[PDB]
Design a binder for this molecule. Structure first.
Ligand SMILES: NC(=O)c1ccc[n+]([C@@H]2O[C@H](COP(=O)([O-])OP(=O)(O)OC[C@H]3O[C@@H](n4cnc5c(N)ncnc54)[C@H](O)[C@@H]3O)[C@@H](O)[C@H]2O)c1
Length: 392
């Protein structure tokens, strides 16, 4: 408890001790920063007054890893799991069976990306503890997760960077009030976020000889696509060409590119990023609904898209990195995709003379289940993070 915290403190560098002191004074804004820091430009990240703070605190946590799986407790907002409603008010004592089952239906068969610093407890909160929400998380952290106990009373810091699944929910009572206790698990996934260099090494390791697994026709067609053939190919797909104006030559190229993507399937759970334009979600740059600075437009977007399916007729390019790019400066929707191990796809940026950087291509006709949508501020512009899973 407190004694652990005083022991673990000795393991910290002076800079890490310094980061922890700031955290105690500024926990809220640092945690918030730790959740969205990787979505900005590299130069915005390096300039941020809380960036050195992030790195140091990240490092401190990694110096105390657990030797076995451990359960942790913390309260969470239901909106985190795409339940955009109160389970019950603070004044109310009961959670109805209907509201319980509505929450169950919402979280069922979904994976939820969790990120950023979080204060946890090893003990179930009781009669005299802070209970901010009606939703209590009981999450199993795997062996080797960093965990930093520290004195302020005593708290424990973790850094979330994984998907969670909710295995079971139960209605419990603490101090004459109903809560939903959620038993959750960690599903791991490779997520490079802003570390594009490490993502490149992984990509090149896994796709260096991808060309040599391709037949000559497959190789020629993939080459054609990357040399600029994608415009005609994808417009044909977007425009419903196979149905309304068939082109067998194009159909043949499409088939070969699809077979090439299935040739060396994504070897692990992978998170990728796409800065989406308005037309991917049935909008335009001048659509009033595209103004996410107005809250009713975020609600309307979530109402249409959250919990729903999105599919692309075209081949879909994504990145192993989450950072913003000037080419995408005016895009407001960041698509954050989990790609299950064994899915079609290829790191195209592993091909010697290819101009594209950090790029993973996904198969045409791909479908994504949107688990959860978040908003964030990018300067004055509100932007959206769409937490999606490729369903192959
Ligand atoms: N967008 C990303 O985050 C991303 C990531 C990695 C690589 N790239 C590559 O960067 C280059 C330029 O980026 P880009 O995104 O403008 O190229 P793109 O070909 O992906 O997009 C072209 C335009 O049409 C779009 N579009 C794509 N699918 C659509 C659909 N199903 N319905 C309607 N419109 C659709 C986009 O919104 C955009 O306005 C491309 O070569 C792309 O492959 C992009």
């Amino acid at each position: 408890e407190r004694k652990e915290a005083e022991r673990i403190e000795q393991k910290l560098e002076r800079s890490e001790k310094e980061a922890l002191e700031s955290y105690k004074k500024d926990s809220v804004e640092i945690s918030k920063y730790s959740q969205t820091r990787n979505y900005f430009y590299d130069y915005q990240i390096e300039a941020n007054s809380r960036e050195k703070e992030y790195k140091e605190l990240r490092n401190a946590i990694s110096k105390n890893k657990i030797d076995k799986p451990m359960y942790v407790y913390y309260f969470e907002s239901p909106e985190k799991f795409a339940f955009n409603k109160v389970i019950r008010t603070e004044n109310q004592n009961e959670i109805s069976l209907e509201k319980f089952n509505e929450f169950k239906e919402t979280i069922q068969n979904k994976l939820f990306k969790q990120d950023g610093f979080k204060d946890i407890s090893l003990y179930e909160p009781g009669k005299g503890d802070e209970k901010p929400t009606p939703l209590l998380m009981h999450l199993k952290l795997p062996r080797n997760t960093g965990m930093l106990p520290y004195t302020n009373n005593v708290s424990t810091l973790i850094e979330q960077g994984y998907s969670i699944k909710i295995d079971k929910i139960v209605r419990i009572v603490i101090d004459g009030k109903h809560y939903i206790k959620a038993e959750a698990s960690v599903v791991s996934s490779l997520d490079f976020k802003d570390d594009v260099s490490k993502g490149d090494s992984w990509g090149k390791a896994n796709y260096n000889d991808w060309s040599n697994k391709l037949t000559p026709n497959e190789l020629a067609d993939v080459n054609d696509y990357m040399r600029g053939g994608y415009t005609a190919i994808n417009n044909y797909l977007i425009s419903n060409g196979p149905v309304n104006n068939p082109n067998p030559e194009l159909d043949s190229k499409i088939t070969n590119i699809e077979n090439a993507l299935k040739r060396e399937p994504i070897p692990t759970n992978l998170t990728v990023y796409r800065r989406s334009g308005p037309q991917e979600f049935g909008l335009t740059l001048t659509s009033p609904e595209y103004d996410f600075n107005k809250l009713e437009n975020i609600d309307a977007f979530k109402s249409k898209w959250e919990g729903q399916a999105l599919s692309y007729p075209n081949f879909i390019s994504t990145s192993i990195g989450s950072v913003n790019m000037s080419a995408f400066a005016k895009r407001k929707i960041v698509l954050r995709i989990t790609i299950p191990k064994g899915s079609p796809g290829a790191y195209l940026s592993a091909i010697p003379g290819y101009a594209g950087e950090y790029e993973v291509l996904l198969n045409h006709g791909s479908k994504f289940k949107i688990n959860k949508i978040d908003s964030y501020k990018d300067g004055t512009i509100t932007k959206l993070i769409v937490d999606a899973t490729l369903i192959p």
